């Protein structure tokens, strides 16, 4: 009863996809070939789950912050949940805008229980494809689905998209109508860990494997249906 988040509000919620492919040369970052494949797969996957998907492409760090501020000020009263997917370069605690780094905490802070009252008690999911090189608790009801473990790299294929996002979409398509979200993400962990190994001319990046990392401060079970 009190065991699963109420998911029968009129709307499932927003799914904001920030898809950063092209970076200013001053950042030293290269283009993220394959990311459009991820963005398309996510858009369709979340649409099938009945999320209102908004795809945003190539945002500066200022635009990322302002987008999240604005979304946090919408009335989410009729929405069950909130999803934000970040596709970009990153380091631990940092996601890149096209023109430089944004602290992830600055993005998520807009949605804290005491700052976005119409999402209080509702699950807020942040799904992050990026490297990680190194009354109620304010952090409650957040879930971070990281593509990789702390301190590690995350891999993206120019043809197929990122290992994590392709695996996540596949597992949502197959299991979202029958498994709780943590159990879906556990299958994503196994798929990523067992079905992929990197190929690179750079030995630093070659023959490597990846394990995603689920960080949950959720207080209830999450099913993408009622």
């Amino acid at each position: 009863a009190d065991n699963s988040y109420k998911m029968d509000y009129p709307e499932m919620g927003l799914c904001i996809i920030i898809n950063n492919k092209n970076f200013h040369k001053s950042t030293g970052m290269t283009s993220r070939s394959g990311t459009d494949v991820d963005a398309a797969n996510l858009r369709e996957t979340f649409r099938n789950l009945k999320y209102e998907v908004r795809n945003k492409n190539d945002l500066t760090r200022e635009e990322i912050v302002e987008l999240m501020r604005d979304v946090s000020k919408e009335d989410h009263s009729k929405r069950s949940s909130f999803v934000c997917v970040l596709l970009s370069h990153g380091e631990e605690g940092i996601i890149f805008g096209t023109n430089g780094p944004v602290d992830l905490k600055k993005i998520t802070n807009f949605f804290r229980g005491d700052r976005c009252r119409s999402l209080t008690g509702k699950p807020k999911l942040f799904i992050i494809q990026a490297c990680r090189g190194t009354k109620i608790p304010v952090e409650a009801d957040f879930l971070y689905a990281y593509s990789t473990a702390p301190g590690y790299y995350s891999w993206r294929n120019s043809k197929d998209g990122s290992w994590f996002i392709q695996s996540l979409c596949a597992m949502l398509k197959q299991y979202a109508d029958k498994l709780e979200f943590m159990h879906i993400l556990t299958r994503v962990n196994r798929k990523v860990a067992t079905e992929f190994e990197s190929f690179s001319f750079d030995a630093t990046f070659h023959a490597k494997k990846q394990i995603p990392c689920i960080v949950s401060m959720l207080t209830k079970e999450l099913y993408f249906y009622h």
């Binding site: 370069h89 990026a130 490297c131 790299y153 995350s154 993206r156 990046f205």
Partner: peptide
């Protein structure tokens, strides 16, 4: 394959 490329890293993020």
């Amino acid at each position: 394959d490329e890293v993020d």
